[PDB]
Design a protein around this nucleic acid. Structure first.
Ligand code: NVP
Lengths: 402, 527
DNA sequence: TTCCCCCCCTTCGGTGCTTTGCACCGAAGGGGGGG
């Protein structure tokens, strides 16, 4: 086994367990009873003080429930075992391939055992309805699915499994993030699907049980546009000066001196204003200036990306990924049932794109109540990873994105 | 007694008790030795020589294990929550058992017995069982009894057994004569492991007093609340009354505490008197009238659906009941927390709905179907327009007033012919004096001097001046994001009476449009 | 002169704009039922 060192001078995972539905508890009981026979998990006693939350989910077009353990505190504590010991350099060409396919290789982690000294740190509890009985506890005997150290130990086996394939097909790009594998290529759909199927078989003959296409050319950051009115009015003109005034901070080549020159004395908001030609020039030039990309915005590894989502209404959400404010690395819209479901899918899509582009999930700022999210986010989730989310307290008053 | 022990450790850089000689009065010293000799007979405590450098202070009324409790490793929490009677399934027969010397009938870890050194002034001994008063003892006892009880349930699954510390409630649907033979089987099984459960003639009879509930086999109720009688109440008296009313609300419908919760504000002294106003005393009398008669809950039937009515008592206080059959509440409760300075009734409905959602997930394992006093189109408009995300699981309208409705609404585009105002407010930050006023497009103008109001307050009440000096169709232009954010949320209650007056003005107007313009750009009338 | 497990309300401290006043939120006090 590979010994695992915690970051020096820190405690362990002591996290409470969220209450769960009857269906998601029957699923957990059945899954863990089946996992204990294989020896993957081991029942534990009172001498173990640690805990991490556990939920159950379903995959795309799947009926079988899947156990899912939240390992975020453990990752924050064991990132010494990764940053020092394995920092995987993110491929740069992954952003451009015509199609990237995402595959689940988490089951391949069940083969390799876990360090015996570390096991006590991965304890978890299946609770009971109404606290009628003490929840049954367990511990991992093999490498878990969710930890950031689990793929780092298995790097050698996946390289050995994938090398007889990387030799034959050097064009495709294979990247690994947590339990998930991204394979990117420029082939057409028909050849790409068969290529991915035969690749799955190369792993299967190597003894991997491995069971989905995002088009990266479509993933391009969106431009900003000034509003266009053939007929201008006092309310419409005042709105533009504010929108441009907000825009000045993010793009500092935008000017509103002549545009505000018309508005000098009280006038009914509804009244039409003939627009002066000199001001029309500033409007004409400004729309083009908005298209021109900002300069100085280059990804920096030292900091962590932060993602904002703003509900624009009628199924439309707009998100921005920024290392620091007024400098956006990406910017986009998501259009789509429900409203917590829409935010869940938006979060998943944003972080999948962020993993493809920069190789790390952002810190999300969610426009939802903390308690409603913590109740319902696990009902429409379908990803083995989980980002770090905060919640916002005040309306987006600017809201000048859509 | 033949039970596998739990291997205990200690924290790094720690040791056992180093307590020095403990003084004791002679009559206690000689008298207690007989218990120590007695316990040592069955082997609960064993004499040890000088190999132990640990000693523990002696108390008589009992061992001061605080030194070990502080220096011992952390353990898993024994009780992360207790059942709620509403979720208990209905049993035909229920029985209570109490295992004697339970903390003494489970052995202690061999390597840990050494640290439990106790000396009588003097000869020493060490505990061979789970020492009472220890930090980790309840968890170890719980684990041991779980292991002991599992096989019996494995043969017989038609019974259900619950372990509250030492107590063992056993329930079944078997006939009384056939239930007694099952309880005798359980008694024999616990005898096989050496546990002193009582005989048939000493077992308790229903109801059972557990955690403040009287539990019957086919119903449940709350421990009788004796309402304090104080013509001159105090801080402590009001606190106790509020606590007992909050506790008692879970089965007595419609209990108010907010009027009495108000009186507990800003009282540093514990004893200083707080007279009950007319409202507080009236509410207290009504609560006494409610508690006059006794009401009982019923037991969850997992073959029927869950309904959760929600009513509004007014003033931001909500009551709810949960039942399966009509007029048979499984549970009741109230939601009354105020969140934020400004909010309205729809948002508070949302918070109440999600509260009941979480509680019903915890207690019953599934979400109920709400019967809400809100119109479908009202909720639809609110969630489509609001800037957050929210989703009420499942609900239907109930035509039981008072209903929920947003008392007003703004306009999206400026109105033609509507009178247009250009407001502003300023205040001197050093002296807390300022001005507020507007310049209407038609020509009307007005300015007000102001004291004891900050910049935000004056910018907020410039809107009040504009609304006062307007008609019905008004187009206000504001140069303040703070006031805009306050007004734009459609608040219908607040902790500021200025905003209360603003809301009262805004409900009167037929159509109000308000817009925002930047500061320092010299836009139109603003400059 | 214990450990605290939940239920509720008020008071108060830190954070982040809505910026040196004000907006939410979690962490200290009490009560209630506990053993
Ligand atoms: C305190 C407690 C906790 C959980 N369940 C029960 C009890 N005690 C009862 O007396 C009881 C009463 C009614 C139904 N179930 C009960 N039982 C169940 C076990 C038969």
């Amino acid at each position: 086994t590979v010994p695992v060192k915690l970051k020096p001078g820190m405690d362990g995972p002591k996290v409470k367990q969220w209450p769960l539905t009857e269906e998601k508890i029957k699923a957990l009981v059945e899954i863990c009873t089946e996992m204990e026979k294989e020896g993957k998990i081991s029942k534990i006693g009172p001498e173990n003080p640690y805990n991490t939350p556990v939920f159950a989910i379903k995959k795309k077009d799947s009926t079988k429930w899947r156990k899912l353990v939240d390992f975020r505190e453990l990752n924050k504590r064991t990132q010494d075992f990764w940053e020092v010991q394995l920092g995987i350099p993110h491929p740069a060409g992954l952003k451009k391939k015509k199609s990237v396919t995402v595959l689940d290789v988490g089951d391949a982690y069940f083969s390799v055992p876990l360090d015996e000294d570390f096991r006590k740190y991965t304890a978890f509890t299946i609770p009971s309805i109404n606290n009628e009985t003490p929840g049954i506890r367990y511990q991992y005997n093999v490498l878990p699915q969710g930890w950031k150290g689990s793929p780092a130990i298995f790097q050698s086996s996946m390289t050995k499994i994938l090398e007889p394939f990387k030799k034959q097909n050097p064009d495709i790009v294979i990247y690994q993030y947590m339990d998930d594998l991204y394979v990117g290529s420029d082939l057409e759909i028909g050849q790409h699907r068969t290529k991915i199927e035969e690749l799955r078989q190369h792993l299967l003959r190597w003894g991997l049980t491995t069971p989905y296409e995002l088009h990266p050319d479509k993933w391009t950051v969106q431009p900003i546009v000034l509003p266009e009115k053939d007929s201008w009015t006092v309310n419409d003109i005042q709105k533009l000066v504010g929108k441009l005034n907000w825009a000045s901070q993010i793009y500092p080549g935008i000017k509103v001196r002549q545009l505000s020159k018309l508005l000098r004395g009280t006038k009914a908001l509804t009244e039409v204003i003939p627009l002066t030609e000199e001001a029309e020039l500033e409007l004409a030039e400004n729309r083009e200036i908005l298209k021109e990309p900002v300069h100085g915005v280059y990804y920096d590894p030292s900091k962590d990306l932060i993602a904002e989502i703003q509900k624009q209404g009628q199924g439309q959400w707009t998100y921005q990924i920024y290392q620091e404010p007024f400098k956006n690395l990406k910017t986009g819209k998501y259009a789509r049932t429900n409203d917590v479901k829409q935010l869940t899918e938006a979060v998943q899509k944003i972080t999948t794109e962020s993993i493809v582009i920069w190789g790390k999930t952002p810190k999300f700022k969610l426009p939802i109540q903390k308690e409603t999210w913590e109740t319902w986010w696990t009902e429409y989730w379908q990803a083995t990873w989980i980002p770090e989310w905060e919640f916002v307290n005040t309306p987006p008053l600017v809201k000048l994105w859509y | 007694s033949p039970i596998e022990t739990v291997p205990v450790k200690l924290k790094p850089g720690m040791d056992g008790p180093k307590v020095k000689q403990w003084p004791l009065t002679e009559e206690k010293i000689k008298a207690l030795v007989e218990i120590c000799t007695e316990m040592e007979k069955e082997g609960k405590i064993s004499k040890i020589g000088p190999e132990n450098p640990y000693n523990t202070p002696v108390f008589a009324c009992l061992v001061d294990f605080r030194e070990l409790n502080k220096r011992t490793q952390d353990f898993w929490e024994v009780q992360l929550g207790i059942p709620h009677p509403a979720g208990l399934k209905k049993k035909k027969s229920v029985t209570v058992l109490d295992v004697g010397d339970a903390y003494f009938s489970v052995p202690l870890d061999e390597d840990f017995r050494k640290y439990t050194a106790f000396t009588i002034p003097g000869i020493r001994y060490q505990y061979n069982v789970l020492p009472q008063g220890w930090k980790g003892s309840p968890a170890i006892f719980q684990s041991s009894m779980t292991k002991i009880l599992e096989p019996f349930k494995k043969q017989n699954p038609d019974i259900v057994i619950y372990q509250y510390m030492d107590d063992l409630y056993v329930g079944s649907d078997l006939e009384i004569g056939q239930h007694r033979t099952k309880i005798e089987e359980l008694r024999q099984h616990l005898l096989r492991w050496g546990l002193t459960t009582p005989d048939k003639k000493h077992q308790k009879e229903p109801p059972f007093l557990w955690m403040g509930y009287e539990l019957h086999p086919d119903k449940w109720t709350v421990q009788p609340i004796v309402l304090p009688e104080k013509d001159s109440w105090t801080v402590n008296d009001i606190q106790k009354l509020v606590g007992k009313l909050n506790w008692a609300s879970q089965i007595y419908p419609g209990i108010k505490v907010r009027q009495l919760s108000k009186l507990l504000r800003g009282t540093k002294a514990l004893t200083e008197v707080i007279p009950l106003t007319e409202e507080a005393e009236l509410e207290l009398a009504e609560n006494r009238e409610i508690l006059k008669e006794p009401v009982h809950g019923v037991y969850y039937d997992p073959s029927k659906d869950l309904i959760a009515e929600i009513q509004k008592q007014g003033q931001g206080q909500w009551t709810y009941q949960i039942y399966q059959e009509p007029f048979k509440n499984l549970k009741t409760g109230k939601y009354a927390r105020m969140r934020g300075a400004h909010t309205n009734d729809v948002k508070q409905l949302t918070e109440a709905v999600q509260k009941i959602t979480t509680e019903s997930i915890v207690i019953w394992g599934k979400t109920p179907k709400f019967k809400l006093p809100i119109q479908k189109e009202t909720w639809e408009t609110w969630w489509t327009e609001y800037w957050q995300a929210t989703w009420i699981p499942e609900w239907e309208f109930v035509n039981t007033p008072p209903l929920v409705k947003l008392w007003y609404q703004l306009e999206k585009e400026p109105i033609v012919g509507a009178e247009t105002f250009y407001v502003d407010g300023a205040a001197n930050r050093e002296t807390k004096l300022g001005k507020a006023g507007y310049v209407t497009n038609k020509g009307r103008q007005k300015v007000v001097p102001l004291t004891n109001t900050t910049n935000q307050k004056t910018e907020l009440q410039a809107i009040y001046l504009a609304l006062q000096d307007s008609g019905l169709e008004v187009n206000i232009v504001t140069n303040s994001q703070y006031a805009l954010g306050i007004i734009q949320a459609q608040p219908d209650k607040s902790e500021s009476e200025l905003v209360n007056q603003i809301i009262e003005q805004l409900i009167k107007k037929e159509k109000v449009y308000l817009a925002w313009v930047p500061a320092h750009k010299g836009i139109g009338g603003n400059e």
